[PDB]
Amino acid sequence: APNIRKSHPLLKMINNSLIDLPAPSNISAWWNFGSLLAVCLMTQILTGLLLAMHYTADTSLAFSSVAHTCRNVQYGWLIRNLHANGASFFFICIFLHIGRGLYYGSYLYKETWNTGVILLLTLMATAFVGYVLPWGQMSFWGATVITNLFSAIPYIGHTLVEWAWGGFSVDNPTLTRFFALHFLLPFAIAGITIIHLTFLHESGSNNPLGISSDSDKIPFHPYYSFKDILGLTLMLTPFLTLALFSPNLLGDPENFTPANPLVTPPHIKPEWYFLFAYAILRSIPNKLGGVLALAASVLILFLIPFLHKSKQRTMTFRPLSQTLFWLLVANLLILTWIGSQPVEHPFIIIGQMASLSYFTILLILFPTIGTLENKMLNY
Amino acid sequence: AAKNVVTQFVSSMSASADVLAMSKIEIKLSDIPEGKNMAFKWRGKPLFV
Amino acid sequence: SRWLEGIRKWYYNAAGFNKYGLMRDDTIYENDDVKEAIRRLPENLYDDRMFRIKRALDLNMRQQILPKEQWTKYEEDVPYLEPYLKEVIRERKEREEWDK
Amino acid sequence: TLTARLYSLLFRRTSTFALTIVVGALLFERAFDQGADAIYEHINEGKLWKHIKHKYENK
Amino acid sequence: SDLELHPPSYPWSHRGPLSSLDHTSIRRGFQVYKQVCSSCHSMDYVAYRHLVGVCYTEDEAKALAEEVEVQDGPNEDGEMFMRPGKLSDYFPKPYPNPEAARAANNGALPPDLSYIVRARHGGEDYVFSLLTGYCEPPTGVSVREGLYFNPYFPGQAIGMAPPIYNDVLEFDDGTPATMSQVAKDVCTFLRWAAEPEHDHRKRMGLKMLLMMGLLVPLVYYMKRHKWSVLKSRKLAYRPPK
Amino acid sequence: HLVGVCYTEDEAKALAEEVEVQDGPNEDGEMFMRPGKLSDYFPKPYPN
Amino acid sequence: RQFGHLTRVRHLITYSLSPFEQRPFPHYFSKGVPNVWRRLRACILRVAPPFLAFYLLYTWGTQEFEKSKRKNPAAYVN
Amino acid sequence: LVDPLTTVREQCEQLEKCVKARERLELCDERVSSRSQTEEDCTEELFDFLHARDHCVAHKLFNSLK
Amino acid sequence: ANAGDFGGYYCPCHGSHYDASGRIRKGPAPLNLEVPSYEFTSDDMVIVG
Ligand code: HEM
Ligand code: HEM
């Protein structure tokens, strides 16, 4: 090969995943989400790796340390800001990325999709820790529930927790051992992400119409490379805007008060990118039920591929399920609001309700409106 | 071989060989008038009287 | 009271996959059966379908569609693959049953 | 005719192009900052330490 | 009753995504903290060091920190001993420990005001209100021995007595030291205090915004420039017959 | 440690009683001495 | 999957011009903006509805809550 | 020396809303302090006032402050 | 303490309401609060543990 861009074991990979990669010609922004997700993975790993350069995982020093890392380290403040927010831009993109995939049945690439879930899960997992790290009122009390959340699993539970975290109560150990997980985990996300793309490439990228694209397919490089660099700057501007103008805009301030093992803040509102499932959890009064609900609240994505009935892949030609879809996306934006809302009649019910449409819309509505639309075509 | 190495590197966390027993606390009941509840720092978690 | 006929017509224009100018069948996700189906297609209809798809893609990729004129009309939609696909399926269902 | 003069001389040879990105960046920097800094400060007259530094250094 | 009153918004001199903090105001904000809050309110994350170049002068802050003696390292004979507060010391703690403070403030714990502004929803708007805003409990409502009604505070019963009235001090710059006024200055401080980066952070934001403005279009052209090959493009099916 | 290795629980406990240790803040917050429990570390002879 | 082994494509003549011989800008106000609306108006009636519905359920929910807080002038007329 | 606050709360305490509120309160106040046994509290009413008062207190107060 | 619909307790985490006895009455909480080992040593004395 005179090529080189193809005759070099390493070098090929690149000129095979960034150049020369066949990608569908027709692809909406909803396809950038992922390349972005990467940039987050990076921005997170880069900033956090750098923020760990100043963190001091240990109760008595943990909180302050960060403060120091901000006030004392040049641009250390910027680093933090960026980090906590990448967290979000990260969940945002992920939340959108899942959207797109859901409504173009990209979940048909199963493996590429299943791995995806894992990523989500992990990204949810890693983000749980890390937030504990700054050891604020939130950090602490989040540690205590989320962890204790495994209380539900019988027999192996109470035990698994008094292990999950340090000894018998969220205390220093749990902290150090969390930092470790956090420092570690992201690198797992990175790995799996590789596994994710691998599975993908096995099957070209999807495409909005949901019909073969071999008919077209353009060289990833010339095109999409730019397109990514663009989307990079686009959904980079907001994230930065936040980080430079109203950083804590998304960040609960309650966490600015160092942890107190004795008083959980009246008004414990979990992180936004978590609220939905949060709601679901509390609107199902039963430790186990509460948890279970939650369990499936996210662990349901795994079933979407089996809850696909449309004779067509995407649903751009499925106006019916189509609105059912937004009924879902909104039913989600709802659960969220209902999550950032205390528990009283005005809410609560609304809660468990949406926290019912959620499931049904998925487990039942979709597949039904699914076959139905096929018959409205003689299929 | 493994069975153990596992067990080992599994208890290399559970507990910590550091356990207390402050199980004994003295309270002035007069500090808590009728109708209210006082909270105390006791054994890693709060105590209500 | 309400014609399934009357309805299908709805859904058809509602799906609006004819705005891109491609027959119903030009859409059905390509699963094992369909592939075999399409692989049985007479070369005539194949190249036809292809272009229709590439055109569809090209449009879609431009975000623009086909002039109100060129949309395909419900009654004129040609189920060019349904027939093959069906044999396929039953061919299979025949085999699947025999292997028991 | 700028654009033409530019291309031929600056953007044609991949060797050159780059060279102007550099020398250009140096210029863009220096200029963008001074401009930015000014825009900023001006939108905050008498509020910055640079601006009160004087009640222990006059103004 | 989970019934509460939400603090009105004041057009602070530094609210604007592009407006820095009135450093003059912070200077006073500092003094009001030093002269009246720094006797109950600890502020562990700042230090005279900062004031230098932001609202005070090197020599100014140095002599400013001399103003306090601090317990420092072991002797040769090893014994804590006091000595003039240097420049690098952190703002003095009023109490050796919390429970000590709680025993000094009618059983309450005056929270450290380092990150106060961003630890309570509302920041300055809240804080300001809280200070300038005490009053007799409406009827049927009775605050117990030692507390003081303040509508804006949850429970409406605070353990902090109105710590700010007219003249409590005298801003050496010649500023009508009215409550409203001082209380303002304290808040603008509490802000910087909570996030010194403020200005530097917004200025930055400025530039960041001018780059997006400039960069994104550029790459947009580039994105379109490159795609035109396709956007433009034209198909056609020509079989032989 | 001593417990189970060269001493007995009750043995070490009373063994640790043998020393008073400076411990946490009052309510009025002030270091105060109190009987050395079982979990204390061997006494330091010098403050520093 | 790489290039040259994608599909059996026959008889498709495509003509495209170098980007430098054409204009990227494009034809806004002619085909540009028009199609944009051609779409806002196409899906508006398919996307907005549910969001709108939420909104209501949000407001309703909030007001009611904010109401159930205020006293019934007649919870004690005596 | 006079606190621009108190002066500006004077003007504000006169705006239509304040009055339509200050009144609503005044009643409740003397509506609860007039009885021996009542659970009512004039907090709510109190807020509504404040809420309204301070609101303009803000629209103007910072103008007189340096 | 001193909050909730059962005049005992309320946990802001998931809405579990407790009665003044520490029992769970409403919400997702599973068992009633923990009652430590204790006794009174006199008229004003109370010892927990
Ligand atoms: C000095 C200008 C000053 C400020 C500013 C101030 C503010 C302040 C805040 C914002 C809080 C409370 C926030 C909350 O919701 O808990 C707070 C709390 C207390 N303070 Fe204060 N305070 C100022 C000065 C002083 C001074 C001089 C004293 C001691 C005389 C004092 C005390 C306290 C106490 C006690 C509280 C406790 C609140 C409670 O738990 O009920 N403050 N202060
Ligand atoms: C996968 C992406 C990551 C996620 C989801 C993430 C998320 C978080 C979050 C939300 C916090 C709490 C921040 C806050 O207080 O608001 C955090 C803290 C932290 N993260 Fe990450 N993190 C990630 C990766 C990293 C990496 C790779 C490291 C280093 C190995 C890291 C090190 C830290 C440090 C130092 C803190 C403590 C200081 C702080 O709280 O800001 N993070 N991370």
Ligand code: HEM
């Ligand atoms: C770990 C972060 C993740 C990264 C960085 C990542 C990356 C990618 C990328 C870049 C693609 C290429 C096409 C595109 O951009 O959409 C892709 C596709 C896909 N990813 Fe992810 N992904 C991540 C997480 C997930 C998650 C959480 C899901 C789970 C629902 C998921 C599901 C998919 C699907 C279904 C596709 C294939 C179909 C298609 O591309 O149209 N991904 N992902």
Ligand SMILES: CCCCC[C@H]1C(=O)O[C@@H](C)[C@H](NC(=O)c2cccc(NC=O)c2O)C(=O)O[C@H](C)[C@@H]1OC(=O)CC(C)C
């Ligand atoms: C030495 C560098 C090797 C390059 C690695 C890097 C490589 O896959 O880069 C792209 C192709 C990848 N996305 C895409 O290919 C992609 C695919 C379909 C459409 C679009 N665009 C939408 O319009 C894409 O953008 C994007 O998601 O990054 C991944 C995931 C990976 O990088 C990650 O492991 C890094 C993590 C592990 C830290």
Ligand SMILES: C/C=C(C)/C=C/C=C/[C@H](C)[C@H](C)[C@H](C)[C@H](C)CCc1oc2c(O)c(OC)cc(OC)c2c(=O)c1C
């Ligand atoms: C080290 C990692 C371990 C032990 C594993 C933990 C597993 C993490 C999982 C994926 C995470 C929490 C998921 C987003 C779950 C499903 C959502 C539930 C969730 O619930 C919460 C909750 O009920 C709270 O009650 C007061 C408070 C909270 O924060 C202050 C949260 C919270 O932050 C999250 C998020």
Ligand code: FES
């Ligand atoms: S933590 Fe008590 S309601 Fe769940």
